[PDB]
Design a protein around this nucleic acid. Structure first.
Length: 437
RNA sequence: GGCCCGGGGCGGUUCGAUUCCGCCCUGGGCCA
């Protein structure tokens, strides 16, 4: 239908209802009491304070303000104590510095220590500028909360909301800065259509200019880039999503995509139709945080891809899947098998010196002259993609992530054919080959 | 801790490497 009509109905998918709101209100209230019965200096921030939390994602963030002089450990010890005392049930967590997380009257709570500061430049850690962002934002985002959610509801449905390494999308702060700059969801979507990989959005100066890379400069620090961890392809996917949304508005842009558990029978057929080589490197998932695992899987998946291209197996694409127990590096190659002999380029006929050394090597077949320079035939140590990765992974387990690599050294295997479609990697495999349905 | 980027002290591969494939420091950024 028409845009406006779609946005109206979409709100019902991103705006929290009376219940969830009340539930959050009474939780918010109780939390302040307990905190004051202890007389603690606190400041509710984040999406909850400013009423811009995507429906069904309720979570109260509470930053504790300690004097600048207090030590790092002092903030941790005392921070922990207060979080322990105030939460129904706690559960320490980490991100640059420890912090306490738990539940109160039934809702998600984060209790984070940080230095009460004046002047964004004295900042010593992520958590320190959070209060500032909140500051800059509360006055400027009032009355637009609902536009913030449409944008969040939009991004999450198309799997690119969060800014953690597992997604490389848009952080919530980024979403609000984009609303403050454009005024509403529609205007944000309309202008995003003209975004490029060299676009710089500066809200403090209220200006859009051409720069070295996608840069949304932080109102609080002209040096920080709010979309810094937003990947090039996810930016590209967003620009393309807006062009489509404006062209064919659909409430279907705010709804998650159906997993589509394709029949393992239809898949084998498709792979046959492609005539390609499809395989996976499996290994035990290192026991580490997703912020560390994913960048590694990307590195590993990447290193092996390049080993394949220079090795001549014409790799189409790579992919990767991490479950609870194992991790899979997926690959598809245009070359199931390649000949054992290949040609290597020798020196020009001109200099007898280099030619002499090149013609002095023990070779199965006689080298020849072509277009002025010498070349030699030679044998490969492997002729299929899987053979190559088996050699490569076994001999280069390092260089594939500190942890990921260390896991491959102790154990790994190559799965192919029927045996692979039985593994939990089908959705990724379909996504990778661009199977449509 | 990890990943990315930008600099400095070594092997294997190759007729031939700073330049390919990798292993041991210094400054930036990112999840923060």
């Amino acid at each position: 239908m028409k845009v406006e009509e779609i946005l109206e109905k979409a709100l019902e998918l991103v705006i929290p209802d009376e219940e969830e709101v009340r539930k959050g209100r009474e939780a918010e209230e109780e939390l302040r009491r307990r905190l004051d019965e202890l007389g603690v200096e606190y400041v509710f921030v984040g999406s909850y304070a400013r009423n811009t939390w995507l429906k069904g994602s309720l979570e109260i963030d509470v930053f504790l303000l300690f004097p600048e002089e207090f030590s790092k450990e002092e903030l941790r010890e005392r921070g922990l104590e207060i979080g322990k005392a105030v939460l129904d049930s706690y559960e320490i967590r980490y991100a640059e510095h420890p912090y306490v997380h738990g539940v109160v009257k039934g809702v998600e709570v984060d209790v984070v220590p940080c230095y009460k500061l004046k002047e964004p430049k004295n900042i010593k850690s992520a958590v320190d500028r959070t209060p500032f962002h909140h500051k800059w934002l509360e006055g400027r985002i009032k009355g637009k909360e609902n536009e913030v959610r449409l944008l969040k509801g939009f991004l999450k449905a198309n799997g690119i909301y969060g800014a953690e390494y597992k997604v490389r999308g848009f952080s919530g702060y980024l979403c609000e800065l984009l609303i403050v700059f454009y005024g509403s969801f529609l205007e944000t979507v309309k202008n995003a259509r003209r975004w490029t990989r060299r676009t710089v959005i500066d809200v403090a100066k209220g200006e859009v200019r051409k720069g070295e890379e996608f840069f949304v400069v932080d109102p609080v620090d002209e040096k920080r880039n709010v979309a810094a961890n937003l990947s090039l392809d996810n930016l590209a996917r967003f620009v393309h999503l807006c062009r489509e949304f404006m062209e064919a508005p659909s409430l279907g842009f705010f709804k998650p995509k159906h997993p589509l558990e394709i029949e393992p029978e239809r898949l084998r057929k498709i792979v046959e139709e492609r005539g390609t080589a499809v395989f996976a490197v499996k290994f035990r998932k290192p026991d580490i945080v997703d912020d560390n695992l994913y960048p590694q899987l990307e590195r590993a998946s990447r290193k092996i891809f390049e080993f394949l291209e220079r090795e001549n197996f014409m790799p189409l694409r790579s992919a990767f899947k991490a479950s609870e127990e194992f991790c899979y590096l997926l690959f598809e190659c245009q070359i199931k098998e390649i000949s054992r002999v290949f040609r290597r380029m020798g020196p020009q006929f001109e200099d007898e010196r280099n030619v002499k050394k090149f013609l002095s090597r023990n070779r199965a077949f006689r080298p020849f002259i072509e277009n002025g320079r010498w070349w030699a035939f030679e044998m490969r140590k492997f002729t299929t993609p899987e053979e190559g990765v088996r050699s490569y992974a076994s001999t280069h387990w390092h260089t594939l992530g500190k942890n990921v690599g260390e896991s491959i050294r102790e154990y790994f295997e190559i799965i192919s054919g029927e045996k692979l479609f039985k593994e939990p990697v089908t959705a990724e495999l379909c996504e990778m080959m661009g199977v449509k349905d």
